[PDB]
Amino acid sequence: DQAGITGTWYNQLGSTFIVTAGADGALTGTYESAVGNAESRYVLTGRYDSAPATDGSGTALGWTVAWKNNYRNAHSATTWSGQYVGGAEARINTQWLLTSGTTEANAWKSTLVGHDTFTKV
């Protein structure tokens, strides 16, 4: 699924996920969030299962963005964990965790959780 994953994806918020899948299981690219304390592109890296099951299952993958670039620093990082599902309506179905750096006193509220669905259109 190197060819299936590589490209430009869009989620339900209108964020843009630009990724290259390497033969070795690497994910590289950029993320642009339509929401939150974010502007322009941020570096992402991650991993995917480069030899998935042949039993109709999706392809497990994940990636990280740290919300620092040349424009802004939100002192936070999001990880998306999900699976790629190929076919006419290809999708990447994810759940995510967004952790902010906090004081010890605020650590109980450090982490947001949500779900993003990415499509090729």
CA 35/CA 114 separation, integer angstroms? 13
State which residue, 8 or 45, has the beta carbon closest to a copy of itself: 45
State which residue, 35 or 121, has the beta carbon closest to a copy of itself: 35
Positive or negative torsion for Cα 114, 40, 19, 48:
negative
Shortest gap between Cβ of 39 and a copy of itself (angstroms)?
16
Shortest gap between Cβ of 76 and a copy of itself (angstroms)?
5
Contact 17, 28 (CB under 8 A): no
Q: Is residue 42 a known part of a binding site? A: yes
Q: Which two tokens stand for residue 17?
A: 């996920």
Shortest gap between Cβ of 52 and a copy of itself (angstroms)?
6
* DSSP H or E run through 5: helix 2-5
Q: Is residue 63 a known part of a binding site? A: no
Contact 44, 33 (CB under 8 A): no
List residues binding a copy of itself (CB under 8 A).
13, 24-27, 35-36, 43-53, 55-68, 73, 75-83, 85, 93-105, 107-115
Q: Which two tokens stand for residue 102?
A: 């906090």
Residue numbering of the annotated binding site for biotin: 31, 42, 80, 96, 108
